[PDB]
Swiss-Prot record, chain B:
This is NADH-ubiquinone oxidoreductase chain 5. It comes from Sus scrofa (Pig). The gene is MT-ND5. GO terms for biological process: electron transport coupled proton transport; mitochondrial electron transport, NADH to ubiquinone; mitochondrial respiratory chain complex I assembly. The lineage of its organism: Eukaryota, Metazoa, Chordata, Craniata, Vertebrata. InterPro entries: NADH_DH_su5_C, NADHpl_OxRdtase_5_subgr, ND/Mrp_TM, NU5C-like, Proton_antipo_N. Belongs to the complex I subunit 5 family.
Swiss-Prot record, chain C:
Belongs to the complex I subunit 4 family. One of its GO terms (biological process) is aerobic respiration. InterPro entries: NADH4_N (IPR000260), NADH_Q_OxRdtase_chainM/4 (IPR010227), NADH_UbQ_OxRdtase (IPR003918), ND/Mrp_TM (IPR001750). The lineage of its organism: Eukaryota, Metazoa, Chordata, Craniata, Vertebrata. The chain crosses the membrane at residues 22-42, 60-80, 98-118, 147-167, 193-213, 224-244, 257-277, 284-303, 308-330, 351-371, 391-413, 435-455. It is an enzyme of class 7 (translocase). It comes from Sus scrofa. This is NADH-ubiquinone oxidoreductase chain 4. It comes from the Eukaryota. NCBIfam families: NDH_I_M.
Amino acid sequence: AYLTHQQKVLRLYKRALRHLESWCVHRDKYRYFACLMRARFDEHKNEKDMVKATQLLRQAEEEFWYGQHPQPYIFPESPGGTSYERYECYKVPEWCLDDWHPSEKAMYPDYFAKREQWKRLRRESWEREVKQLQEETPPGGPRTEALPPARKEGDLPPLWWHIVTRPRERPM
Amino acid sequence: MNPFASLTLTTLIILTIPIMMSNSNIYKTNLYPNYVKTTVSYAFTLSLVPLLMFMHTGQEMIISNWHWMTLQTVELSLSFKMDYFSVMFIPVALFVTWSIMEFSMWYMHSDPFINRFFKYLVLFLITMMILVTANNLFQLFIGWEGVGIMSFLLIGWWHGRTDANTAALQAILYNRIGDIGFVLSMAWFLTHSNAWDLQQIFMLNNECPNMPLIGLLLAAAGKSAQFGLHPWLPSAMEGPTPVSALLHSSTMVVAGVFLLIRFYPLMETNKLVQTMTLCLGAITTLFTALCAITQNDIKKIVAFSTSSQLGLMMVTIGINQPHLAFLHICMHAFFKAMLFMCSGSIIHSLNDEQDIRKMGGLYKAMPFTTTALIIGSLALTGMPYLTGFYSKDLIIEAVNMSYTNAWALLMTLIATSLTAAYSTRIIFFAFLGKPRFPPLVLINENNPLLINSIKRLLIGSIFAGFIISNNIPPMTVPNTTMPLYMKMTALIVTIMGFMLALELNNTTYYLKFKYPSQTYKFSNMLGYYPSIMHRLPTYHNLSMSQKSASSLLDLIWLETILPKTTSFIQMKMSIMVSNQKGLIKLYFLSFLITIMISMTLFNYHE
Amino acid sequence: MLKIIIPTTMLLPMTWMSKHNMIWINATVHSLLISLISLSLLNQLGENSLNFSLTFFSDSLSAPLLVLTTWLLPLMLMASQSHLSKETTTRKKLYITMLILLQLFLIMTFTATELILFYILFEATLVPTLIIITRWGNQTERLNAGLYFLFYTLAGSLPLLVALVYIQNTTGSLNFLIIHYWSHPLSNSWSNIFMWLACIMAFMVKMPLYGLHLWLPKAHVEAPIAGSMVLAAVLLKLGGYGMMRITTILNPLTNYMAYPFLMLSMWGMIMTSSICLRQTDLKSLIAYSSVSHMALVIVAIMIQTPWSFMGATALMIAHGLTSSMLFCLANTNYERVHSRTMILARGLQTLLPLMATWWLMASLTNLALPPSINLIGELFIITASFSWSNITIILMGMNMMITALYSLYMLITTQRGKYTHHINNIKASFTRENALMALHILPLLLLTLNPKMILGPLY
Amino acid sequence: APPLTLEAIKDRVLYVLKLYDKIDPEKLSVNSHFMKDLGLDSLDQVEIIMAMEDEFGFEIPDIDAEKLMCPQEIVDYIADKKDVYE
Amino acid sequence: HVTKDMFPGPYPKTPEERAAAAKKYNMRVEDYEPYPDDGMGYGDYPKLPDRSQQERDPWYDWDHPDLRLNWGEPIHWDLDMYIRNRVDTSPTPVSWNTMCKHLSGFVAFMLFMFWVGEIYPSYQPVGPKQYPYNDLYLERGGDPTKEPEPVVHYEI
Amino acid sequence: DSWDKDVYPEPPRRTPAPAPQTSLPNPVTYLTKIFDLLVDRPVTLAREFIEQQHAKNRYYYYHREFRRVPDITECEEKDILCMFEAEMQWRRDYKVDQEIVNIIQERLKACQQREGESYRQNCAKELEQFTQVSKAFQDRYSDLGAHYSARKCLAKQKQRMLAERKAAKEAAA
Amino acid sequence: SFPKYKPSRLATLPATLDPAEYDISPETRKAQAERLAIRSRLKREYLLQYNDPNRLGVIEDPALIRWTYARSANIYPNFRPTPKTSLLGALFGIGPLFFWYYVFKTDRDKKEKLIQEGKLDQTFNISY
């Protein structure tokens, strides 16, 4: 939804010292700076009518963007880094398990037996998880990208399969 | 005669053997990485046997083992230019490859495609050393794309990464821009000198090779990553650190400049043609070394200091020094392989980290890689009795006293200072500084195979040229006596390259907010060059490919003029002539005027 | 030469009287047999062509085309195995009849010894392909597809006919041997330039030429899988084979008024390649890349340099193959997903690795990577053009800018990359696709080792 | 990279809270919710999120970085982000 | 599932078809800005701001994170123009004009200042290479059958 | 030497005489001695195998010769019988003329590499002899196009012929 | 002060720099709910059919085939021959062609000015 000062200055403070640690590199310098931006960040947490609260905020973003480290540090496993989407090459969906060859099916029998009961609980709980979801769905479909749980008895939390059966973050 | 050729021809044969076992899948998975390691290792040890022939005899000879076809007066044949340039490049090249791919299997160890990777390295040498052995320019071109399209595959080792696929696009694009001149040189050679053999090209004594050397100079700009087509190496680093160390450190980038030194009998014939070589080379060294002056990684600095170096060998041929360029690339591979080798060791030891500003205290925690990085920088930064002496000291002095443009000189001293500058900048951020890695302590090098691979190339990084200094015959015209100030400039430019980095390293030691400045960003984003070249021209041309191509011309205009309009005309006046009122009176009324016009107007009677 | 003609003529009773189950098993098992029979035609003399009879003859130019057509015929059989399995048996026999009849008209056309006999069998091929494109097509526009096909080809074909009979009444024979030996200079009169216009525009239309090319995007894209390969692979090349044949009496006017065509090819080849890089339909890419390569060979014939005729033949077979795997590959994604949008299916090696292996080697074949005959033929065009004009390189060098800019582009968005987690339709690769893939690409590396036979008559 | 376990990775983070001199070693709890169970609010939390991120390697997405606020609900995510069943 | 309405028709001149075409691209009524209608061929399709697929939120649970797409939401006409692999429209720390000034200002300096050195090179105060045998012309390719005037020198 | 020097002249064989005043055992020589004994001898015996088994049956081939036909010059205009022979004869001469510049090219190719840097003067006659081959080859065939013919070859030959014949008359002055 | 960033066609002004996105207003706050709802149902009709075990086929995107038809088919049914379209077609069609004609016609005759009275080099050009 829309962003409010708290959500936004928390966003600000993330990037701000990400530049600062990348600016200073060595811990201790950035350490003294990071904790003093903290005081500099609370040096005005009592402002009057929200217009100034917004206007000073505008001054925060501009000096942030030109104080943004032009080459900032990004952790590789996260978006923008070396390891970002690196293992998506090894990512492979679960439906390739179904078309396994019968001779190869008998070479991994226990793992195919477990997928049989895993897809079994997929089917026997899919229809109940969805019917409950539509009846509890407010009119006009969903009002947000939320998901109802298995709040009742003997049910699975609706729309669980793909996110339960999501490929592991290190498919290797 | 009996030896020499057959031995090295076996070398080409014997490491092709791993490939057609791989297609036949006679390898048992994990055996193949060691299997190819062995074959490349003997491919080294056998390659010295032709080498030993060159130190004593010094003879060279060309083999034509097959004839492809005869285009009337042009009989394309499988001709190999086997010579000093060919034979000695062999052992240094694949021993470096043999050295690195060991560090690869330790690094590249989890991805289940080890074999697929390792064969991909195996065919990579096959295309390389056929370029240096090729005699007909067509065979050189075969290997020219052979490495190019295979760098695309190798840097695209992980299809999950879209930047890798993005990186390959400009890598092929800039390489393709280079080989246009290769085609232009081919076109000139096939029309004017009507030949393909390198030996034939030079021996015709084409003393006005303006268009060819323009093409070869363009060819280097892509392969050797000169100015304009530089940023593909800053793109190719995304490919795994081993293969990036294998390809884009000094092993296939030098192929482009090696092409000019191959063409040396006609490369330097035109004095003017030499001139813009110094021009193209100088701007690289200023630009690339500038980029490495600030780089928050451990890959860009090496690549830029290479492209700065690739901006020096062709400077020597720009001042009519082929072999001095040729020995430069040999030492180039000797230390630049390591700089990436140890850098990748940091990425493996310290979990997938590349930027300088995320790790400290690497001296005590990483002693051997510290020693390897120290000597590797020490080797490159012109130091007597190592790679720098016979190569970097020799080139700096040579361009200094030979006839050259003032700025062609000026960049070399500046860049060499910059090479001495950012080499210590990464050494500082590597070792000097408190640990900057996550509390989970996992940094290690106890793996002997990584340790072994380093020391097998250590002997190169400190000995290098000395093992072959007096062994190779002197092709360089010496100067002996000459003024002493610019002869020591190389040793001068190193020292203020050091402490300027040192004091700036101490600014990172100094507790103070260092203000952002254009100079720091200018170096980090390559002078904002990829920010426009990778964004502006491609957006405009392909947007034209959206509107001017389909919507304007093809889907509308050519389809409007002939098909739609003419079909409309048939459709438009059909109803004027087909649909009729049907009342009988007008039909015979129409018959009336038909009689007169037949009888009177044209008067078919007359 | 009825060694090859009659067994193909007889193939119609063969498929028609075959049993219910075999038919396709029958159709292939004998079409391969005819292929090695046609492989005999690789016997050329130096320059004197193989004159088998009064009406049928072949040379070093025709024979590579004959082997291409005859060996092609099994490929659309196996290619059409998947697409046309549901249909009843009688139309199954009829569809194979259209394929056999098409290859039948192709082999006689390439081997006619009299110009009008070539012409009657030149445009006789649209009649079966019109049936193939329109009846067995898939998408709605296929109706307008056929109309664009025949009307474009015919719009130039009839002027050729009027020109051909004129030469008959003027010289006394349209036979290739007689017209070659009695070749006379075509003067510069306004009557003669229109005669040149008549004898050239027919092939130029189904060359195609920039601007006169709309049919292929509106036909190949919506043509049936079998029909689509055959159009681009060989039915492109009747005009070419004719072009080197009729260009023996159009001198010297060709060197004087080929500039507008050399223009329109050179700009078009860059234009077609650039727009090829900017389509949302993958099938349009092979169509648009096809003309880009095809625009190159028109340049070859116009300069009519020996080296130009060298690569005209080689690139013809090279591209004629090249379009074949891509259309076969582009087919394989289609029925699996029932769409020809490259965006919908990306990174297929994570699901179909072997298909990806075939995809990339066909792609690099399109790149004209030596020693493949794709480059050497394409390269000879560059050398001839430089002999014609040294400047020529830049515009065509711009073509070695766009080709790989798109020819690896669908790779990194069809076979390479990540997969969308919603398509569970994608399954394992039936061995047919890889098998036909093998007979498709393995040849091109094979005769690569020995390029002289498919080099052309200028050897 | 080891077979990382939730028990090992949380005991890393309970150190950070006890290494948070503001978050007293006695004030340590697996459910030390910062603004109301501890008092260090969202501003006094987001810097800790980067602090753990700086020592964890991963960067928790901003939508839940400010939100996952109780030590167990954070360590639930590194269990999710690493996706290890221990 | 898809009969006639979803495909673009004519340009939605009237507000009624403006809203229908907004519903057609399952967007809101107020944020629907169709492409300019002047011989352009786009018609129903709306103006899409230059937001590349690299620029979109990489932390969002995109259905197709390949180019950060989702299900059903509208798509740019030049989507393939601006995708993560191809050109990107993303913010930069410092103004595009600044690149233009430095990139022009940077590169323009050398070929200018390198033009100056084209008149002023650097060398050592050392004389030419006086050579025996008429300055190699006997064996430097040059034909010696014609009178090869011997240019000989002496140690000064 | 299945070839002969009259068509394939090669420089004489002059080798030096090393005088190893040093003391270290020369590794290069030992590499040869092990190489001929270990590599040459076994494959030589296999080569000696293929000799006498090839000698137990030696079928002979002979040269294919063509009688020289009347040329297009005496070939009657628009005639089709004796046009065939003269057109055949000219095209064989075309293929013949390509292989001799090829032979001079191959002779040219060997001259440089086998004579090292000395080829600048060692190929001086080799360089000169190509030029007369190439220039006369152009006068034989140039600007003939893909559809070259014996008539068109004579048309070019004639075109040059009266031009120089008129020039010779003009040169008389 | 400090250097100031500027928007561009590819270097667009960041949301952080633009104060307009910071202009909190009731119209924007109320507007976001609709996009939240329409994306919610789209996520819903993505997940149910995707997570449905019975959905063995391909779930098409209505926005996908609207674009494909748009980019190729809808052009000419909506095309209008405006004067600017003719000009763009002229400078992207016949225009560039005449560029190649004039440049290619020139050097061709420039070459033809070389051969006739012997001022061109043909020492090795025997592979015409």
